[PDB]
Amino acid sequence: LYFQGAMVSVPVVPGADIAAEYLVAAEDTAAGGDWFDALALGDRLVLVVGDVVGHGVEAAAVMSQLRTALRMQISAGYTVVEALEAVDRFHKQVPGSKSATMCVGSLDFTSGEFQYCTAGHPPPLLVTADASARYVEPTGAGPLGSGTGFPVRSEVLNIGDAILFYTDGLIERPGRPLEASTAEFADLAASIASARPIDRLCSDTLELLLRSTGYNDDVTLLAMQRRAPTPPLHITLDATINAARTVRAQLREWLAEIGADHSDIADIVHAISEFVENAVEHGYATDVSKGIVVAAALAGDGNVRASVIDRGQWGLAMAEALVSEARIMHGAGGTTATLTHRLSRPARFVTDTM
């Protein structure tokens, strides 16, 4: 979810929790030379952090183009390497884009394989399940317009393992030398690791690191922890007056496990509750036993898809106005009401200590 091509929010997926927090060096401006991105592409999750030189009203403009450029290639299904190379060739047409740096990674949901490239960009922190932090190795890539190419490495992340993409603003803090400030970020991430766990890992790291020391560049932190997927939801109920109350309760449990934001929860629970109520009241089978089937699942593209199937009734404008997409189908002996809703959690935009 974007506002003006800018990511104001992070997606939600079965096999990873993602959080994002950022600060902008300037005053009264929504963006600088930094950006982050997280694209849920089905069989994988692609993470992006980037830094454009000299922020800078001019630096935002450059960032905006690069972001749109990288997103277009990634979402068209090119690999990390191919995408980065498309962008590097594109930079010629984007003045000020030379020496922009990026860190891009792709998580395979099945294997935990996380293929990443550090294009002249400080390397990701890995916080493991047993609260060991350590930096992943730099891939050997350099920034845009460096002719270094874009070589890529891999790390296997287990369930509970997290990884932290960040910009140099996080570790180049006022009155702090690089190797000390690097080692403090790592230790603190370790410390905090012994909401969702990735939220506080992301939130608390950044706010203690900057608590006293302040900041002087753009700062962007994009964290994701691998998790075991919540199984899909399935309920088979009697077409009774309490059916909706039953479904709502369980749908709430489920969406909490999934890790959805309250707005998405409110939307989706509203839609499905109304489908169930409509099924009950409208409502023409005199056999009410197991007359209602509800199913809901989160896919790796960040959409929840749900269906309410009943034994036929004598919801569109309602549901179409609440969730990304809704549909109703009728046949003899049945009605199916469906919804598809994209999940998002907002990024945290902070302004504290200069």
Q: Which residues are annotated as a binding site for Mn(2+)?
A: 51-52, 168, 217
229: closest CA among 44, 15, 10?
A: 15
Strand partners, 226: 16
Q: Is 51 in the site for Mn ion (CB under 5 A)?
A: yes
Q: Are 348 and 203 in contact (CB under 8 A)?
A: yes
Give me the least distance between CB of 84 and Mn ion, in Å please.
18
Q: Is 58 in the site for Mn ion (CB under 5 A)?
A: no
Query: How is residue 85 written in tokens?
Result: 């190379």
Q: Is 238 in the site for Mn ion (CB under 5 A)?
A: no
- Of 154-162, 213-221, 241-249, 332-340, which segment contacts Mn ion by CB under 5 A? 213-221
> Cα(303)–Cα(315) distance, rounded to whole angstroms?
20
Give me the least distance between CB of 170 and Mn ion, in Å please.
9
Q: Is 120 in the site for Mn ion (CB under 5 A)?
A: no
The DSSP code for 2 is: B
Query: How is residue 256 written in tokens?
Result: 């909490």
Give me the least distance between CB of 307 and Mn ion, in Å please.
47
**Whose Cβ is closer to Mn ion: residue 150's or residue 166's?**
166
Give me the least distance between CB of 24 and Mn ion, in Å please.
11
The DSSP code for 13 is: B
Which residues 6+ apart lie within 8 Å of 285 measured at CB? 239, 291, 310, 311, 312, 333
Q: Are 305 and 340 in contact (CB under 8 A)?
A: yes
308: closest CA among 333, 332, 284, 273?
A: 273
The residue at minimum Cβ distance from Mn ion is 33
- Of 2-10, 28-36, 267-275, 280-288, which segment contacts Mn ion by CB under 5 A? 28-36
Give me the least distance between CB of 281 and Mn ion, in Å please.
58
294: closest CA among 254, 241, 343, 258?
A: 254
Which position among 108, 155, 168, 207 is part of the footprint of Mn ion (CB under 5 A)?
Answer: 168
**Whose Cβ is closer to Mn ion: residue 33's or residue 143's?**
33
Annotated binding-site positions = 51-52, 168, 217
> Cα(207)–Cα(248) distance, rounded to whole angstroms?
36
Looking from the CA of 110 toward its CB, the CA atoms found within 13 Å total 2
Which position among 217, 264, 267, 310 is part of the footprint of Mn ion (CB under 5 A)?
Answer: 217
Q: Is 33 in the site for Mn ion (CB under 5 A)?
A: yes
**Whose Cβ is closer to Mn ion: residue 107's or residue 171's?**
171
What residues line the site for Mn ion (CB under 5 A)?
33, 51, 168, 217
